[PDB]
Amino acid sequence: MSSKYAVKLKTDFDNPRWIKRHKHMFDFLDINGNGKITLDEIVSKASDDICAKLEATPEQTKRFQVCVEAFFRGCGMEYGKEIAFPQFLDGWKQLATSELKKWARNEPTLIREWGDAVFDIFDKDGSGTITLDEWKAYGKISGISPSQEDCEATFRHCDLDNSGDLDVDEMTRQHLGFWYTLDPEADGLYGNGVP
Ligand SMILES: O=C1N2C=C(c3ccc(O)cc3)N=C(Cc3ccccc3)C2=N[C@@]1(Cc1ccc(O)cc1)OO
Ligand code: NA
């Protein structure tokens, strides 16, 4: 049926591959290996660590911190509260549901704004475009994708602009499928760095 001006979107929140994916990332954020994380740690990872090592400007650093802050609050996190993976994953279920609704209605999403924040640190033209070399640097500083081979797979996997560079809107589409819905078209986005 035509759904009568609705669109049917698939989620896969009970698929073990989606659980493993976010479990992989939880462990990566759980640096002290105690099975708990805090919004405080995350925002400090964003500004005190990533943005400092990239040498983002103060305003660029604040925009990134605010987007990181708003994104993981979307998962039910709050500064001063430790959180464990099972409530982390349920937060992601809610975040993904609300984000997909806004995407379908052409409204701003937290994932897009986070992308805009990362790209603008690298892109001198302010057009949301980055190069393989810039992504490799982010992959190494954030730690999500330190392998150059994994980063090349990212550009191999995405559709690039006519000069071989990566647009923020392509990466946002990829991220919706990779983190929210387990779209098979997004498998391989980080090479072998992220399952
Ligand atoms: O998507 C991204 N990430 C997702 C998760 C993450 C964390 C936990 C999960 O359960 C799942 C995913 N963690 C980090 C790394 C990070 C985390 C916190 C603070 C700073 C950096 C991270 N960096 C991003 C930034 C990004 C965003 C949009 C773009 O268009 C391009 C790049 O690029 O991949
Ligand atoms: Na921890």
Author numbering: 1 to 195
The authors write:
To elucidate the structural basis of the influence of mutations on the bioluminescent properties of the photoproteins, we have also determined the crystal structure of the OL_H64F mutant in conformation before the bioluminescence reaction. The crystal structure of the OL_H64F mutant contains two photoprotein molecules per asymmetric unit. The final model comprises two protein chains (A, B) consisting of 195 and 194 amino acid residues, correspondingly, two 2-hydroperoxycoelenterazine molecules, and 264 molecules of solvent. The OL_H64F mutant, similar to the wild-type photoproteins and their various mutants, is a globular molecule with the radius of ~25 Å. The electron densities detected at the Ca2+-binding loop I in both protein chains A and B (residues 29–37) are conditioned by the bound Na+, just as it was found in the wild-type obelin and Ca2+-discharged obelin-v. Although the coordination geometry is typical for both calcium and sodium ions, no calcium was added to the crystallization solution and hence the ion was recognized as sodium. Thus, the comparison of the OL_H64F mutant structure with those of the wild-type obelin and the OL_Y138F mutant certainly evidences that the substitution of His to Phe does not change the overall structure of this mutant. As expected, similar to the OL_Y138F mutant, the main changes in the substrate-binding cavity of the OL_H64F mutant occur near the N1 atom of the 2-hydroperoxy adduct of coelenterazine. The appearance of the hydrophobic side chain of Phe instead of the hydrophilic chain of His hinders the access of the water molecules in this part of the substrate-binding cavity but does not influence the hydrogen bond between Tyr138 and the N1 atom of the substrate. It should be noted that Phe is found in the same position as His in the wild-type obelin and the OL_Y138F mutant, i.e., the side chain of Phe does not drastically disturb the structure of this part of the inner cavity.
